[model samples]
Target: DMDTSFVGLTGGQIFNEMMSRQNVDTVFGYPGGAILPVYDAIHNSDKFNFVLPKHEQGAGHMAEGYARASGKPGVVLVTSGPGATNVVTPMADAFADGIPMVVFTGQVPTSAIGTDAFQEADVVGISRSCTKWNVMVKSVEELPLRINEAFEIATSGRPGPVLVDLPKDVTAAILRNPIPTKTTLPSRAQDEFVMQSINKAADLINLAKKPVLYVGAGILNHADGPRLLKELSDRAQIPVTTTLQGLGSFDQEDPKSLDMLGMHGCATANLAVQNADLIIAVGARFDDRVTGNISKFAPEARRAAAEGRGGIIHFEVSPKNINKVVQTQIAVEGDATTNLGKMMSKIFPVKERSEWFAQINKWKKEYPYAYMEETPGSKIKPQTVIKKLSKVANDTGRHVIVTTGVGQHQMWAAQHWTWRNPHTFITSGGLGTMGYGLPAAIGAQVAKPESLVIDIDGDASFNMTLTELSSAVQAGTPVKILILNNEEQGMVTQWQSLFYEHRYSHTHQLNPDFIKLAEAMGLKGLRVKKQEELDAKLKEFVSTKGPVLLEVEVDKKVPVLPMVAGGSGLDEFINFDPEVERQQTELRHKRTGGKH
Candidate 1:
C-alpha cells in the first residue's frame, strides 16, 4: 500500500513508488549525471534490483530478452545525450519484433531545455519512429500519469516498446498529493465482422484437401496460444510450419510439424507451403522473408483459387496486418487465444488426408535437413557443433535456453536445436541485430537462474559487444558464450562468393585472443581447434561454475546451404554440392564476364 500521509515528496520518490506498485522487480540501465537523483532513490530502497550493464545498448537488449523469456514488460533506464541515443538500435529492434518494454530516459532540466546544456539530447524526437508511444514529463504532477500510461500502451493491443522522458528539474520538484494507484484504458469489443470472418475461416479450413497452419511470433503473446494451436492442428489434421521467431510455439518433434519455413528453413517445409491448397495464417504476418517473391508465393494455392478450389484465411489481432502483404479471403481480427479456441470448438476431427501426407513425406525423404558427419581428419563445421551441443543438452536433461547473434550462426542454431517448449529460444528475429547474444543470454539467465543459458555467436557478431563480459562478471550471471570463430564475416563472404564474382571484399577479420580477454574479466576461457576436442571442451564449458567463453575455430568458407536466392521463389534453392558450386561459379563468370 502507498503511504498517503506523505503529502509532500520529490518526483523521484513518486516514480519509485509507482514502479514498486507495478511489480517491477528487476531493471537494467547505465547510470550518468542526469539520472543521479533516481539512482540515489534506488539505492535507498530494497524493493528494486537494478543491473548496470557496460553499455546502454546492452541494457536495452537485456531488457528485451527478459521480456521475451518472462512474459512481462521489460523496464530500462538511462541518462541524457549519448546514453539515450545509444539505445536507439535496441528500441527499433523491439519495435519491429513486437516486444513489450517501458524505457525511462533522463532529460536535461526544464529551464535548460534548448540552451545546449551539458549532456543533453532530443530523445523524444529521435525515438518517435521506434517507440509505440512517447511523452516527456513536463511537471512533477504528471510523472505518475505518464509512467502508468507508458506501461498501458506498451502491453495493450499489439505490444511494443514505449518511452517516458523525465526532466531533471521535474524530478527535483515537490509534489503535494499521493501518487495515483490506478490507471485505466478503454477496452475494444469484437464486432460482427470478426465473428463472421472466423466462421468463414472454419468453413474454408474444413473443406480444404491440403490445409497448412503458418504460425508466427505473435502467437506467443497469448498464454494459451500454443495449446490452442496444437488442439486446432490435431483436430483438423493440418500440417504445421513456423517462422524463425515462432520456433518453439509447437513441438518440433510432432509428426505434423515441418519445423521452420523461410529462406534458410527446411526444404520439406518450403515445398509444403508452395503446394498447399489452403494457408491458415494464425497470428502470422506474411513477411517478405517467408513469402519470397510475393507474385510466385503459394502459386499452387493461387491457381486453385482461380479454379474456385482454394483460398487463404488469416487470424490476427491487428487490423493493419490483415491482408497487408498476401491477399486473404477471410480475416479474423481478435485475440489469438480467444479466436483460436472458438474456431477449434466450431471445428471437428476430419479424415486424414493420406495422399497429401504421403506427398509431404516424400519431399522430406528426398531433401531432408542434414549436416555432414564429423570425421577424425575433417575441419570442424558450425552445424556439427550445434547438433552435438543439442545432443549433450538432451542427454543431460538440462532445461536450456538458447540465444544467438545474427548471421550464419543464428540460422545454424535455429536449425539444429530441438525446441520442446515455447520461450526457450530467444533471438533478434525482425531486426537481425548483431551483438545480441551475450547480453540476451545474461538476461534469460537472470529471469530463470536454474536454466542453462548459452549464447551462440559468430566471430564478427561476438566482437561487436564483447565489452559486456565485465558486466556479466560483475553481476555474477553464469551464462556461457560459444563463439564460432571463422575469422571472417561468414554470411557476407558467402554472398560475395555466390553473387559478386568471388571478389572477396573486406570480409576477413582479425580477432583478439579470447582466452586472455576472459581471464582479464575474471571469468574462465576455453578453446578448441579440432573435432576431437569438441565434446570435452563443451562439457567443461557448460559445467563451469561461473561465466565462461568458449571459442571454436570453424572453417572459413563453409556457407549456409539450401539458400533461396534473393527475389526467388521457395522452390528455387542453392543446395550444397561440390560439382554444383563449380558449375555455378563458371556460370557466374560467363554471365558477368568476370566483373567484380
Candidate 2:
C-alpha cells in the first residue's frame, strides 16, 4: 500500500493524489498560470505520465485518443477561459460519442469568478450542457471528493466527459482534512428489464427468418462486448452491420459482416437493413446518418412486425436511446456484454437462412463499393491508397490502430481498411470533429508504444491540427500520417458537385508543402504523386522508426459514390449507377440555369 501522506498538502497535491488513487497514469494538458500548481504537483511527483500538447484542443483530442484506444477515462488540464473553452470541442466530441474523460480546468479565484478577471470564464456554466457533470471546487477540503465524483460520473452508466472547475485559490490553499480513498456516486440500472427483453428478443430472433445484428460504438468500450456480439451473431446465424463508430466491433473481413451502414455505407449493408425481417440492434442508436428517411428505414421489417412477425429488437445500455428514433418491438436496456452474455444460452443454432443469405450475397456482388479504376498514369484515388495501405500495414503483423478526421478520406478509410479487432479504428463519429486525427494517433501510440498507429488524413482535415506533429515528436510517439492531398474538402466539394451543379464555395484549399511542414516539425516527410512512388513510400512509411508523414496527391474529381442523397431513402443512392449518374448530371447547366 502507498503512504497516506496528506499532511498540509495543497489542494493541487490532493487532486493529484486522488487522481493517482483512481489509477490515472497519463495526463494530456497545456499549462497556464491558474493551473500551474496542479502542473507542479504532477511534474514534481513523477507518479503519473503527462503530455504537453501544442494546443488545448490538441490536448483534449489526445486525451480522447488515450481513452478511446486504452478504454480508460482520459484526463486533461488547462487554465481558465480559453483553456476551458478550447476543450469544449473535444468535450462535446466525447459527450456526443460517449467517450469517458475528466477535464480539470483552472479557474480564477472564487471571488473573481463572475467579474471576468484575467483569463477567467464561467467554465461550469460554459460546459454545463457539454459535460455529463460539472462542478467548481469552492473549498480545498472538498477537492478530493469532487475529483472522485468527477471520475465516477465520467465513467459510470453511459460514459461521457465531465468537467471539474478548479479555482486557483482552492488549489493553492492547504487542505485541512485528510484525503479520502474514493467516493461513490448513486446510479440506477435496468437489469431485470434488460434480461426480460433479451429473452423476448431471442425468441423473436429464433422466430424470424431474416435477422440482422445491427451494431454500433457502444460495444467497443464494453468488457467482452465484441466477442459476445460476434458469438450471438454466429450462434443465431445472423449477419452483422455496424455504424461508423462501431467499425471495429466485428471483423470486417468476416463473411457474415456487411461492413458499415450509413449515408456513405456499403450498398449491401444498407440494403440488408432495408429488407431484413428482424434487426437485432446492439449498442447502436439509429442516427439519421444510418436512417436517411425514418419512414422508409427498415420498411419491410416494420411491415413484417405488423403482420405478427419479428421487427426491431434494440439492445442498448442507454434507456433513452431505445425508442428515440426507430421504435423497437423488444428493448433490452443494458450494455452489450452483460445482455449479450445472457442471450447465448437462450438463442440456439437456427436453420440456414438460405434465401435471405442468398439475397444479401447477390446484393454484395452487384454493388460492392464501386469506384473508378486506377487508370494508367493517373492520380491515384484516395480509396486506392487506403486499400493498399491496409494490405501493407496489416501484412507487417503489427497491431494497427487507424485514426481519421471527418471528410471523404474518413469514408474511404472506413470502407477500405480491414478492421480485425476492437479499439483499432478511432474517429470523431457523432460530432464529426475535423482535426482529431494526428493528435489522436499520438495519444493511441502513447497507449500502445509498440503498436502501429496511423492517421489516414485528408489535406483539409490534417491542416486543421498539423501543429500536433510536434507533439508526436516531443513525446516520442511513433505515429505516422498518410495525408491524402486532394487540395480541397473532398466531401464538401463532392456535395457541391452533385447538388449545386459545381457551384463551388470555399471547399478548395491551396495547401502548404507537407514535406517541408514535417521537416519544420523535426520529422521525416515523404511525398508520392505517381503510381510508382506510392508502394515504396508506403513501405518506407510503415517501416519508419519515428514520427513520419507521407503526403499522397490524390484524385480531386472522384466523388465518394453510392451516397444516400439528403432526405432520401437508404436504398436510393445518387451515384449508385456511376455512368448513369455522370450522364444524368451533365445537363445540370440547363437544370440550374435560373437558380444560379
Candidate 3:
C-alpha cells in the first residue's frame, strides 16, 4: 500500500472513477463555468464518451433515454447553479418512470459556501425530494466512497436518481486520507414474521377461485423478479397484467398475459383485475391511476376487505407498506424475486384453469393486433406504416431500437410493433412527453450504433425538435425517422371531436414542407402521400446511407385504436366493444348511409 494512491488527481479523474466504477462508458452533459475543471479532466481521459447536448434540458432527457434504453444508471454532468437546476425536470421525470440516474453537479469552492460566489447554488437541497439520496462532498477523501454509495442507492431497491454535488475545492483537494476501495455494510436480517405472512399469501393464492397478478415499475428493479412473477402466474395459470410503467414485467405475448391494466387498459383486463378473487400485487404501490377510485377498485374478493377491496398480498422489500387503503390481506417483506420464487415453491400447479386462459386468449384474438392496410386504394393509416416497418426490421434481423414522439403514433408503436427484447421500445410512457423521439433516437444511436435505431414520430411532436436533425446529420448517424404526417394535431382533435361536440378548436395544424427541412439539414428526405408510393419510398430511404426522413401524409384525423377517453373508466375503452361498433355504425347509417 506504499504508493498505490496517486496525488493531485484532477476533478475529471473523480468523474472517471465514478463512471468507471459504474461501467459507464457514455455520459451526457453541457460545458459551463463551475464544471470547466471536470470538463478539462474529461478531456484528459479517453475511457469515457461525453455527449454534448445543445441544451441542458436536452442533455438530461438524453441521459434518461440512455438509462431507460440500457437498463443502467443514467449519469448526467452539469455546471453549477442554472445548469444543475435545469436537470430538475428530467430528474423528476425519471423518478416517476422508475429509472436509475446519477446526476453530478459542480459547485463553487468550499471557501465560497455562503459567500454567493459566481455560479454557486444549493443543488443538494434543491434536489432533495426528486432524488432517492443526495450528497455534497466536502473533502477529497470522501469522493470515491460517496460516489460508490450514490450508485448503490440509485440502482438498488426501486431504482431512482441520486445526485452528488462536488464543490470546486473538494475536486482540487489533495488526498490526505485516501479512501479504501473495498467496503461492506451489514446485510438485512430476514424477518421471520414477514416470511410467515408470505406463506399465508401462498395459502390465499391456493384458496382463490380467480387470481390476477398486478405488477408495477418496482418489479423491473429486482431484475429476475419479472421472470419469477411470470413463472408463478404460468404455474398457477393466473393472468398477469401491468401498469404502464410495468409494461415489461411479463411476456406481453403470453396467453395468460393481459399486458396492461388500469387507465387506458383493455376492457377485459380491467374487468379481470376488478373481479378477481385474489390480487397478488408485487412491487406495486397501488397508485390512484392503477386503482382508479380506491373504494370501487377490485370489488369481488372475499378478502376484499383486506385486499384493498379484495386485492390481497401487496408485497414489499422494506416495511413501508401502503396496503391500509386497499385493506391488504397480507404483506410479504422481501426481495420480489426471492419471495415470489419462495411463494412459487409452496404453490401447486393449476392446469385445469383452462377457462381463465381461454378467456384471455379470446380477448387477444377478438381484439388482436390490427392496423388499417397501406396497400393501394387503402387508407393511409399510420399503424400500417409502422407494421410494415416492423416487418422490414424483423426480416433483416436488425435489432430495432424505436423511440416515439407522443400521440397516436406512440400508442400505435406500442400496440402493433413486436419488440423482441426489453427496453427496445423507448418512449416517454409515464410522462407522455412530446419532442422525445428525435433526441432520444440520437442518444440511442450514439450509445448503440450497431443496432437499427428508428424514431416513429408524429408531425406535431416532430416539429418540436426538428432542428435536431442537424445533430444526426453532423454525426453521420444512420437513424431512420419515420414521420406520420397527419395535417392536424391528431390526438387532440380526436379527443375534441368525441368530447367537445366536434368543435375542433385550435387542433388543426399548418405544416411546412418537411422534405425541404430534411434536405436543408443534409439528410435524405422521402415524401409518400399515397399508399402505392409507401414501399418504394421506404426501400429507397433504407438503402440510402446516413439519416433519412420518410414523411407519409395521411388523413388529418385518423385516430389510434384502444383509446380510453379522459376521465372515463378503464373498462370502457373504445374500438373493441360491440356496443361502440353498433353505436358508431348506427350513427353513420342514419347520417350518411354508411358511406364516406
Candidate 4:
C-alpha cells in the first residue's frame, strides 16, 4: 500500500472523485459563486462532461429526463441557496416517478452552518422528505465514502433521488489518503410467498376465457423487460395494453397490444380490461387514473373469479394497495424481465386466441382514431393539428419527440397521437407541469439532434416558458412548437362547467398576441385562423429549418371525447356514442361541403 501523504486537493478534486465513483458521465448544471471550486475542477477534468442548462429548473428536468430515458442514475450539480432550491420541482417529479438521480450542491462553510453565511442554506433538511437519502460533507475525509454511499442509495432499492450537500471550504482540503471505493447498490429480493402466489396465478390464467395484460411504469424499470413482456404476450396469446408511463413498452401498432387502456386510453383496451375474466397485471401499479373507482374497476373479473367465474393474477416488482382488494391468485415479486421471461417459457402458444385478436381489431376499427374537420371560417381543431403534425413526422422517417403543456391539448395529443417509440412522448404526466413543453422540447432536441422535437403547448402554458424560445434560437435548435390558442384554460373550465355547476372561478384566462411574442423572441411564427390555412401553413412551418411556432385556435367547449370522468371507472368512459358521432359527422360534413 502507498504511504499516506498530506496531499492538498481543491474542492474540484473531491467533486471529480465523487463523479468517478458514481459513474457520473454527464452532469447538467450551471456554475455559481459558492460552487466555483467544484466548477473549476469539473472544467479541468477530462473524465466528466457538463451540459449547461439555460435555467436551474431546466437542469433538474434534464436530469429527470436523462434518468428516465437511460435507465441509469442521473447526476445533477448546482450551487448553494437559490440555485439548489430552484430544483425542487424536478426533484419532486423524480421522487414521484421513481427515477434515480444524485444531486450535488455547494453550501456555506461548516463554521457558518446556522449563522447564515453567504449562499448558506440547509439543502439536506429542505430535501429530506423528497430525497431517498441526504448528507452534508463537511470535510475532505468524508467526501470519498459519502459519495460512494450516495450513489449506492440512489441506484438501489426502489430507485430514487439522493442529495449530497458539500460545504465550500471542504473542497480545498489536505487529504492524507484519498481512496475512492466502488459503490454497490442495495439488494431488493422477491419473497418466496410471492412466487408461490404467481403459480396460483398461472392456474387461473389457464382457466379464463377472456384474459388481458394490464401494464404500468414498473415494467420499464428493467432494461430488457419490454422484450420479455412481448414474448409473454406472444406465448400466451394474451392481449396487452399499458398505462401512459408504460406507453412504448409494447408496440402500439401491434395487433395484440392495445397500447393504452384506462382513462384517455384506447376504447377497445379499456373495454377489454373491464370485461375480462382474467386480468394478468405486470409491472404496473394500480393508480386511481387507471383503476377509476377501485371497488368497481374489476367488478366483472371479481364476480367471474369468485364463482370460479373469472381469474386474476398480478406479477409485480412490488405490490400496491390495490393488490390486497382482490386476492391475487399469483403475485410474483421479482425482476419484471426475469419473471416475465420465466412465465413466457412455461406458457404454450395458443392459436385459438387469434379469434380474440380479431374481435379486438374489429373494435379498434369501430372506434378508430379520428377528429372532426374544421368549419368554413373557423380555426383548426387541436386534434387536426396533432394529426397533421404526426403525419409529417411519420412521413419524414425522422424520430419525432413530443412534449405537451397541461389541459385539453395535452390529453388530446396523448389520446390521438401514435407514439410508437418510448421516450418519444415526453410530458408532465402526473403533475401536468405547464410551461413544461418548451423547456422539455429543448432538452429532448439537445439529447438527440437527429430527431425532430416539438411541444404541443396551450397558449397559457406557452407563455410560462416563452422566454426559452430565445434559447432555442441562440442554440440553432430547430424545435417546432404547436400552440393551441383556445384563449382559455380549457380543462379547468370544462371541469367547472360540468362538475362545479359552471362556477368559472378564474378558469378563463387572459390572452396575448402569440405572433408578436414569437417575433419579439427572434423566431419564425404563423397564425392560422381559417380552416383552409391548416394544411398549407403546417406544411410550410414543418419544411422550415430554424425554430418555428404555429398557432391554431379551436372552439372553447370542444371537450376531449372518449373521456373517463374523474372518479369514474373504465366502464363509465364517454365513448363516441350515437349523439357524439352524429355531431362529429355533421361537423365534418359541414367543413367538406362545397370545398374545392
Best model number under lDDT:
2
The order by descending TM-score is 2, 1, 4, 3
lDDT, residue 436, model 3: 82
lDDT of 1 by residue, 1-596 (tens): 34343358777777777787778878999888777777776875777778789999999999888888888888999999999999999899999888899999999998998898999999999999999999999988778778888998898878899999889888767877564444311122456666777888888887789888999887888888999999998998899999999989999899898888888888888989999988888877888778877887998788767766777888787877977998777888877778888777778687688998899889888886665556577679898889888878667677888899999999999988887788889999888899999988888887877888899998899888899999888877899999999888888877887787666778777799989998898789999998888999988988888999999988655678778878789878666676665566576567547742
Quote the lDDT for 230 in model 4: 79
Candidate 1: misplaced stretches above 4 Å?
1-6, 177-191, 371-376, 581-596
Local distance difference test scores for all models: 0.84, 0.86, 0.73, 0.74
- Local accuracy of candidate 4 as per-residue lDDT tens digits, 29-107: 8788777778878776777666666677777776766566556677888999998998777777777667688888888
In angstroms, how far off is 251's CA in candidate 3? Answer: 3.2
True-structure RMSD for candidate 3: 4.4
Output the lDDT of residue 353, model 3. Answer: 82
10 residues in a row with least lDDT, candidate 3 = 181-190
Candidate 4 weakest ten by summed lDDT: 180-189
Error of 3 at 535 (Å): 3.5
Note the residue pairs that clash in candidate 1.
none
Per-residue lDDT tens digits for candidate 3, residues 444-506, read: 787777778889999988887687788777655688898988877777866765666455677
Give each model a TM-score. 0.95, 0.95, 0.86, 0.88
Model 3 clash pairs? 304-310, 306-327, 307-311, 308-326, 308-327
